[PDB]
Structures are given as structure tokens and as C-alpha cells.
Amino acid sequence: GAGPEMVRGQVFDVGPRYTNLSYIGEGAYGMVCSAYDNVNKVRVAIKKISPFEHQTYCQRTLREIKILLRFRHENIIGINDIIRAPTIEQMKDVYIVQDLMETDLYKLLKTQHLSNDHICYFLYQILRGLKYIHSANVLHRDLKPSNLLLNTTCDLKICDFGLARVADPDHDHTGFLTEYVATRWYRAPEIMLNSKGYTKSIDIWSVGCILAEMLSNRPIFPGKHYLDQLNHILGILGSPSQEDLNCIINLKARNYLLSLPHKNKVPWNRLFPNADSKALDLLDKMLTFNPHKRIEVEQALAHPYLEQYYDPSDEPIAEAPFLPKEKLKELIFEETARFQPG
Template identity: 50%
Template sequence: MQEFSSGIYYGRSVNKVYNQEFIIDRRFKIVKELGHGAYGIVCSAKYDDGESHQQTGSSHSTSDGSYVAIKKITNIFSKKILCKRALRELKLLQFFRGHKNITCLYDLDIIPNPMTGEFNEIYLYEELMECDMHQIIRSGQPLTDSHYQSFIYQILCGLKYIHSADVLHRDLKPGNLLVNADCELKICDFGLARGFSENPDENNGFMTEYVATRWYRAPEIMLSFTNYTKAIDIWSVGCILAELLGSKPIFRGKDYVDQLNQILMILGTPPEETLTKIGSQRAQNYVRSLPFMQKINYSEIFPSANPLALDLLERMLTLDPYKRISVEDALNHKYLEIWHDPKDEPECQIKFDFKSFENFDEIDDMKQLIINEVKNFREFVRKPIEEQQQIQLQLQLQKKEEQQAEQYYQDDILQTNMTNDLEKDYPRPQELNDFAYLEQSNPEYYRLEEDLVYGLDGNIHFN
């Protein structure tokens, strides 16, 4: 087995992972490198201290010999948007801690420079899951309808809890759904999550950072519908269900115009009542300029699928968000009847308070908030379990009394594109080559693309 440890630093072991320093609690031994990217590294690690965590009052809700995933988030203070995302991730993982279908955060750590006291990375100790749903689908391993039912049910259970706290995940996709060997599923990655209010006026402008991966992005965002709702996450779940049924993404646009084309090819020409809700005049004109398209039955696309699965899919992938099925009604759908148990589908008892940090835009201010979050969480998880439960109960009661309307603030825009790797895995359908009524060489194509990317935030333009 590869040896990772190379030294000791303030009670922590110093390891080399992907040629970077990876400094962790020395009671943990790194087992395997799980992945890395521009802003982080993830490893699996085994706890080995000779005593149970519960006896020592340690932070990790597991016993000796258990495994965790340790994530190092790097460069968090290099850009405001990265700092804000890290802050959201920390706060929401703590807030949703304990729900069976949301990844569990065990501990946090920051490693300051001994000379300057500065830091630019955070370590998250989380529940270890074997893989994500994207890896499962890509592997080609056989899945049954029972697997699809179980996965969609678990996603909806987690989403119900998230939505009941007036939080939108905004980036649901197979890569953000973790799965273990027992097919237990956990939702992860809350860096793009934002608040939601039943009052439409309070949601204005709050989607400027909505950059969910294009293939799972709700059409009302591209088409600038006058208001955004929790239905944006339901659309993503529908895309995930379709991907399970077909073993590939259902809408695979090479850009946002093409994404809209692919959606309309399957869903058909929208009725007039839906067309009039399109806020972007350019997008509305484009849709009206297209020839009439007949809706394609999902049974033609997925001929071997359970008809009940297709009925649920139909209700999730509805172009008009106001007619899209809710998470509660989806859980009640007959396709999930074998799993559905209202007693096992809790709602969050309090609303998440975004306004406590979303209005902080300076990196130094957000850095201090992150320090406070790490300090408070480390203190909390090191208390006895009974005391933790009592503290949580007191906080819930306090927040219920103080709950007020959320205020939302705009963030910088960061456009997310699918990787070239994914484009190669899922090539563009041949029939779409004849569908582009606007040539890419036409300047109007890029003006339309801009509208679809930014949705209601049409006042923001490409540099």
C-alpha cells in the first residue's frame, strides 16, 4: 500500500497527496486518493486510535477502524465567489447534518501558516461513500427498475428536507449524488445553493450565480420566466431519472441554444400560455420562429421502462414550472409506492438563514465567518452526544422565534461548462445537425446564447 505520511505538524500528520501537502488529524491514516481538481483534493482515510470516538468525545461519529472521506478545499480566498461558495458549503452541511440522504459532515479543520497565521484551505471530514451516480451510470453495470426507484426516492427525500428549509440546491446532477455499496444515496455539494421565498419579489436577482451544469439546467432559467421556484430542482431530478432509464443524459446541448433545441425536440412546441411567460423577448421570438414540433412520447425513447417511471418523468420534465410536479407529490407517486413512508420523509423544522452571511462580499469578512464556523463546529462535535442534541434543540427553538423573511444578494457570475470528456462520452445526436435554424456564424446566435445563459439577469453581458 502506498505510504502517504511524511511528518508531524501541530498534532497532525503531513502527507503528500497528488504532489500536494495534505495535513490531517494524525489519528487518521490515508488509505486512498479519491480525486482532485482545480479547487480541491479528496482522500479516504481510516481512523486508528485504539479507542472508540464516542468514548473519547472525539468529533467523528464512528468507531475505531472506520473510514471517512477527507476533502481539502484549496484557493478559497483567491476569488470572492469561491470564498462565498465555501462558506455556503460549510454552513449548509452543518445545518442539514443528520438527514440520512444528505452527506454527513464529521469535522472541520484549518491549518494556519505558523509564521503569518494565514490560511487558504479548509479540510472537511465527511461520510465516506464508494462512488457517485455518474460513475455508476458510466460504468455500464446493470441496474434494475428497483434501483431506479430507490435512487429517485432517496433523492426526493433529501430534496424534500432541503426545500422545506427554503433552500434550493441548484446543482443536482449524478456527480453530486454519492452512493455506497448498500445503494444508500446522499446529496452533496451545496456551494451553489441559495434561499427561496414564497414572495416572488424577494427572489429577484437571486439567481445570478445559477450555473448548474447545462444538461441539468431548468428551462425557465434560460427562458427568463418571471419567477423561479423550487421546480428548478425537480427538473434536474427528472433529467437524472431519464439518465438512469437511458444510461446517458437526455438533453446534451453543446451550448445553451442547442440545449433549448434538444428540450423542445422532445417536449414539443410549448402552448401559447407557456410562451407568454418567456421573459426574454429574443428567446420568445426564437421559439416562435421554429416549426411546430410534436411532443415525443417517452415510451418511444425508453421502450423497456416501467410505465409508472415514464409517468413520473413526464410530470418532472414539464416545460412550465408551475405545472411541474412538487417534491411532495413526487414522493406520493405510484412509481415510488413501495418505498413511500410519510413517517420516514421528514421536513426541516426551521428555515435556513442565508441573510446572516450572503450580504458579506469582502474576502476578509468572509474569512472571519469561516474561522468562526470552523471553531464553533469543532467545539460542538467534541461535546457528548446528549449535549449536542440539547444544543441543537435549543437552536431550533431560538431560530423558530427569530425566523424572518430572507434577503438575497447578487453574486458574481461563473459560467460552468461540461467537460470535453463528457462531450466525448455522449456525442451530439445526428438528427440535431439539421435542427439549427440559427447558424453559429450568425451574430444573432450569440445574442440568443447570451440571453439563455443569463436568464433574467439580462443586464449582465459577456466580457
């Protein structure tokens, strides 16, 4: 004589394994809760996803599931279970079950001072997970503190592959002021200038911003709107060099940059006067304006700031690197079939 648990306007058809629901958060086409697992005997995170009315939500639901079911890595959130109806017809929602984590780095930074040892460890873990992601030819594309989950022992896992894409550097070019989907504060300068965010360098920029944020508890480039993001970046980095300008061939983007008053570099040791100098040298290298000159993930791991942890033999790579909303609903159905009874 049972029935499904309710949360905050939405049905959570997740029983009988998954009981005692607390609300965590929500978005455009879904809501996250915690719940008690019964096969294993721990509380878990469950996300309800309702994408089937929209093309791009189907694309994003499918990419996140295909990626995370492929990935196995200590610093990357996996999928433990997927709950949906046994028929496409009856399938209105998909529930993704994941390890529950205590907190995230956004909540941690707003409440907690980080010691240099914590920053170093968190950075190591971020980069170790990202070594794996990049090694599969995947870009996360929305790395930010709220997508970095932590447990009580400071173990870190990257989550939210909702904007993730297979890398595509041969098709990265676009016009000036091309709209972009990823979180504004962690967008690389080239996004606003000439990049679609389909190279690995776009993630390194975000990690740079994360590192700067761990050093002061405040976002480094908190732009209030699209182009103000570029204003913030150039206010610290200063004016691009002639060389770096010359790689920007779109005239509208080049002439914008040429239009701006000259700005000199703010040195990292003035923004971050209590920071480790090795941490600032790696920061400098992650926040390089020119994406071709920007440090890569494996090269960041080998940087002297990370020497206490660096062990390439223990920083694994991926074994297996990488439509209308009605054909995508069928791919989601196929892709989640393995978690069904029988």
C-alpha cells in the same frame, strides 16, 4: 518525528486522525481524498478547500458549510469534522471530513444496468433528501448523477452544496441567455429563457433528467453548449404551448421560441420502451416545460410509481429552515470553530 502527507502537488495537513491518503478527484479551488479516521475507526472522505483568494469561492465554501452543519438527514451527506489552523492568519485551507461512500450514480450508470426496483429506490431516496432540502428553503441547484453517492447496500446520499442558495422566487426573473453556473445537461429550460434558478422547480427538473438517465444509462439532454441545451429539451418536449409561451414575457426569449420551427412531443414510451409506465408518468410531470406546472417534491413522493416506499411520516423535514473575501474568511473561521480542540 512526523510531518504532513502529500498527494498530487498539494499538502494535506489532516493528521494525526487522518492517515493513508488516496486521491479521489479535484477542482478549481480544492481536492478530495479518502483517509483512515482514528477516533472512530473507519476510512472517511476528506476535501481540501482553498477559497480565500476569491470572493465567490468564499461565498460558496461558507454556504456549503453553513447548510450541511444545519442539515441532518439520512439521504444527505453531512460534515463529521472540519480541520483548519487555530488562527485566521495560519488558515490557508479548510478540510471538510465526510462519510466515505463506495461510488456515485455517474460511475454506476456508465458501468451498470439498473433494474426497475433500483431506479424506484434511488428515485425515492433522491426525492426524500430533496424533500428535506426544500423544506429548509434551500435549493441544491446542481443535482446530477456524480453528486449522488451510493454505498454497497444502495443507500443514497446527496452531496456537493457548492451552488446551493436559499430560495428566492420573487427575484427569479432575468433576461434571455443569461449565463448560468450549474451543470448544463441538468439545467431547466427556463434557465436559458428567463430564470436565475432561485425556485424549487429548478431542482425537480434536474431530478427528472436523473430519472431519464437511470432509465437508459445516457443523459437525456446532452447539449454541447448553452443554447443547444434548449434545442435538446424542445426536441423531446416539442414546441411550448401558447399558454406556456405567454408566461415568458421577455420579448427576446418569446421571439426566440416563436422563431423556431414547430416540433411535436416525442412520447416517453418511444425513448424508454422498457420503462415502467408509472415511472414515465412521473418523468412527464418532472420534465414539464412550465416551471409553475411542474410537480413539487412532496407531490412526486406521493406519485403511484413511489407507492412501495411512500411514507410521509418517515420523510422528515428540517427543524430550522433558512461581503469581501476577508470578511467571509472570518465567517468561515467562525463557522468551523466548533470542530477545534477546546
